[PDB]
């Protein structure tokens, strides 16, 4: 979904276009002409809001570049099957109705007054004859990502925007599961995203393996599809393609053959179905936090695979040629056990933080050894071993197996950048299980961070002993105004339990408009509610009273959708019934493992001498002016002095304080920041005689 949305983006910035600063705020708003051409919901949340959008589902671009949309013309009050594509001007010279308008089966408008959208964004009633054009689908104004949010018509615009944006951050889990309730866009989005291999021609499958599949076409020609597995994606995730067909099975042309990432039988599936209970619980789900059952961790429901990628190269130098070798200067053999004869880690070897990944030795010039270093070299018999150590090592906070190694050599006639002879890249695969700090989110823009992961015996459980898989606080639902969340919960429970609408006396009044095939559903069925046209409130109210009983012969939820839970700790039933149901939960890519940073002492910048470095030694956290004002308000003068002198810029103060801490003595007095000496030298360079003077006026030296 993320790639498909990226391809259909409409960016208004960049070369030849406006800039963030110069662009006014008036261009970032919606216009009545965006209806059907540019989605008014899907948009970045950050500063690039209103400058980036997406084509609507049915939009087609004109040869001249103007976006068009389909409209089926109504000639004399009878809607026509044939459609015509109108650009903005043609639309603004005509009277365009709405798809929801009640229409007779013969194309006759039942209502004399049909809601109409006309020039300038005006919306008002018109006689059913003046109307000229009518929309094709109620989903014509929404993008592809926004078209797969069930009950979008009940969510607020900002909540819908947040949900649509968060749907594109979901991480593909090890085992994918299609939603119980989801719009009809899932399958088409999956098919057109291109991440599922689809049979090009109709045929019969000869043999299917985990790697490939061969299908014999009816014309006698066989074709083999190679399915990439555990291949790193652009953002570190893994892309697997598991065949979903069996040998000797006839496949029709255009039928899906294997499921890529985030797919369950050829339909988009970004998350799993979890049993949700909506209530506050001991304050562990306080203010958007989320409580999870340990059963999700132990069952690998939300387990994900991430693949890191590291690479080192041996480039020729003036002093000599760098080489990769198993031999390294002065390292114990145990640390080098995992490497192979060629000097690179053996495949399948667990590699930990800071471990050596590929051993290379760089040429050395001339540098007299320090007294004790040279003396020890002489004593131990170890020669100087001038060649230095520059072996690639696992950065800080990395682990996992070594799934694959790829080595390119100039000797084997491989195209490498000039001055490079050997380049090797090692792929490290890590399996992440959900933990505290990770982000989860439903399709309705209700994020959250895992506050706690309770044992399966502490979770509230239904009357039949089934613990709830996740708990969501009820104070964030009505304030944020995304009731579609609760509607989805109710419909998900109805789908999971299965229903049987009574019809012996006749179809009930609330079920008159239900499809004839929707009066019964087996347990764990699949249902869909298209955006802006789906299950009405009466439909859900009727279905909640017709759900099938469990295998035990008892109905858990009431007609209101609430059930009587039991306290997992006290063991006594909760005083009042609680809302329960199955909700679709996704795992966002804002994992805690990436966020955690820590620094005590590491590399320092060169020009500014301030703290700085890579992920091996995380850089320091900026202490801005607002933080300085906050410190000044307290009256804390020494804390600010330290934060700005003794641990930021004092070249000698840093060494002195590190000496003091590692020893028993006290922390010394801070000196003068380098950021002030630098300022004075820079200001003197402009021929400005700048000198600090005491009360006497005598110049002081710095």
């Amino acid at each position: 979904l993320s790639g498909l949305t990226h391809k259909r983006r409409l960016s208004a910035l960049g070369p030849g276009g406006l800039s963030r600063e110069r662009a006014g705020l008036e261009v970032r708003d919606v216009h009545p002409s965006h209806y059907g051409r540019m989605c008014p919901i899907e948009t970045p949340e950050g500063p690039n809001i209103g400058l980036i959008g997406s084509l609507s589902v049915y939009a087609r671009v004109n040869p001249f570049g103007f976006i068009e949309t389909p409209y089926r013309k109504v000639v004399d009050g009878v809607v026509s099957d044939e459609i015509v594509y109108l650009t903005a001007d043609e639309e603004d010279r005509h009277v365009v109705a709405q798809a929801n308008s009640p229409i007779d089966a013969d194309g006759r408008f039942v209502e004399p007054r049909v809601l109409v959208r006309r020039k300038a964004g005006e919306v008002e009633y018109v006689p059913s004859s003046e109307v000229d054009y009518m929309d094709v689908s109620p989903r014509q104004m929404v993008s592809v990502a926004t078209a797969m949010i069930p009950f979008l018509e009940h969510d607020d615009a900002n909540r819908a925007l947040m949900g649509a944006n968060m749907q594109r951050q979901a991480v593909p889990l090890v085992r994918s599961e299609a939603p119980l309730v989801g719009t009809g866009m899932e399958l088409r989005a999956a098919i057109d995203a291109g991440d599922v291999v689809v049979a090009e021609e109709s045929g019969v499958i000869e043999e299917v393996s985990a790697d490939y599949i061969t299908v014999m076409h009816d014309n006698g020609t066989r074709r083999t599809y190679r399915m990439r597995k555990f291949a790193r994606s652009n953002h570190g995730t893994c892309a697997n393609q598991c065949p979903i067909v069996d040998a000797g099975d006839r496949v029709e042309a255009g039928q899906v053959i294997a499921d890529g990432p985030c797919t369950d039988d050829g339909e988009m599936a970004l998350g799993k179905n979890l049993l949700v209970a909506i209530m506050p619980w001991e304050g562990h789900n306080y203010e958007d936090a989320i409580i999870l059952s340990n059963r999700l961790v132990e069952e690998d429901v939300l387990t994900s695979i991430h693949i890191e990628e590291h690479e080192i190269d041996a480039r020729d130098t003036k002093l000599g040629a760098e080489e990769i070798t198993r031999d390294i200067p002065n390292i114990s053999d145990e640390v080098l056990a995992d490497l192979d004869e060629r000097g690179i880690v053996r495949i399948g070897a667990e590699v930990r933080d800071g471990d050596i990944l590929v051993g290379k030795v760089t040429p050395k010039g001339e540098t007299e050894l320090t007294p004790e270093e040279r003396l020890l070299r002489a004593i131990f018999g170890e020669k100087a071993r001038e060649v230095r150590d520059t072996s690639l090592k696992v950065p800080h906070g990395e682990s996992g197996k070594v799934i694959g190694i790829r080595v390119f050599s100039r000797e084997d006639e491989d195209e490498l950048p000039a001055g490079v002879n050997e380049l090797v890249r090692v792929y490290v695969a890590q399996k992440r299980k959900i933990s505290d700090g990770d982000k989860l989110a439903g399709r309705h823009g209700n994020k959250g961070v895992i506050g706690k992961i309770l044992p399966v015996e502490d979770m509230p459980f239904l009357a039949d002993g089934t613990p709830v898989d996740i708990i969501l606080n009820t104070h964030g639902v009505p304030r944020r105004m995304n009731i579609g969340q609760i509607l989805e919960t109710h419909l998900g429970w109805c789908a999971h339990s299965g229903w049987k609408v009574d019809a012996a006396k006749g179809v009930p009044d609330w079920a008159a408009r239900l499809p004839d095939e929707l009066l019964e559903a087996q347990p764990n069925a699949i249902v869909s509610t298209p955006v802006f046209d789906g299950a009405q409130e009466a439909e859900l109210q009727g279905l909640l009273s017709c759900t099938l009983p469990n295998r035990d012969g008892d109905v858990l939820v009431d007609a209101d959708g609430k059930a009587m839970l039991f306290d997992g700790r006290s063991g006594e039933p909760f005083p009042y019934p609680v809302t329960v149901g199955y909700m679709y939960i996704m795992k966002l890519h804002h994992l805690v493992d990436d966020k955690i940073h820590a620094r005590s002492t590491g590399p320092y910048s060169m020009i500014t001498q301030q703290p700085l470095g890579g992920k091996a030694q995380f850089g320091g956290q900026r202490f801005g002016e607002m933080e300085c004002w906050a410190m000044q308000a307290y009256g804390a003068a020494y804390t600010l002095q330290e934060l700005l002198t003794i641990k930021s810029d004092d070249t000698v103060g840093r060494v002195k304080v590190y000496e003091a801490i590692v020893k028993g003595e006290n922390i010394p007095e801070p000196g003068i920041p380098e950021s002030f000496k630098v300022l004075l030298k820079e200001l003197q360079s402009l021929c400005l005689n700048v000198e600090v003077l005491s009360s006497d006026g005598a110049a002081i030296e710095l």
């Binding site: 589902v57 509610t529 789906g534």
Partner: peptide, 25 residues
């Protein structure tokens, strides 16, 4: 009305028929 041959069957609360199928995304 699954356009693709082997789609999973998920009934829908669709009270309106769409005269045009979604084009290539």
């Amino acid at each position: 009305n699954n356009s693709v041959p082997g789609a999973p069957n998920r009934v829908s609360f669709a009270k309106l028929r769409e005269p045009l199928e979604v084009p290539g995304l």
